[PDB]
Structure 1
Amino acid sequence: QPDDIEYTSLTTAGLLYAYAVGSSADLAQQFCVGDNKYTPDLTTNAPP
């Protein structure tokens, strides 16, 4: 852990980044047998 840096700000930024990456899994079908997954489709406050 280095010294003389913005611990609070850097940690809040890293928390936002890590939460975004770790809550929104990539997850998409890669292979099929002619049968794919169609992704068509909490509008107020809710994580993107």
Structure 2
Amino acid sequence: QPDDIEYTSLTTAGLLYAYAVGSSADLAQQFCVGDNKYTPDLTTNAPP
């Protein structure tokens, strides 16, 4: 853990990045047998 860096903000930023990646799995069908899933299917405080 380096010294003389701006911890609080550095870690808020880290958390966000980790949270983004952490909840949105890549998750996408990769192989098939003639039938793919076309992804084509909360509005406010549900995150991106």
TM (normalized to structure 2)?
0.94
TM (normalized to structure 1)?
0.94
In 2, Cα distance between the equivalents of 1:43 and 1:27?
A: 21
In 1, Cα distance between the equivalents of 2:19 and 2:38?
A: 26
SS in 2 for 1:36: coil
Structure 1 stretches (4+) deviating beyond 3 angstroms?
Answer: none
SS in 2 for 1:19: helix
Report Cα offsets for 1:5-48 as digits up to 9, x if no partner. Answer: 00000000000000000100000000000110011121111111
Gaps (5+ residues) in structure 1?
A: none
Gaps (5+ residues) in structure 2?
A: none
Structural RMSD (CA): 0.6
User: How many pairs are equivalent?
Assistant: 48
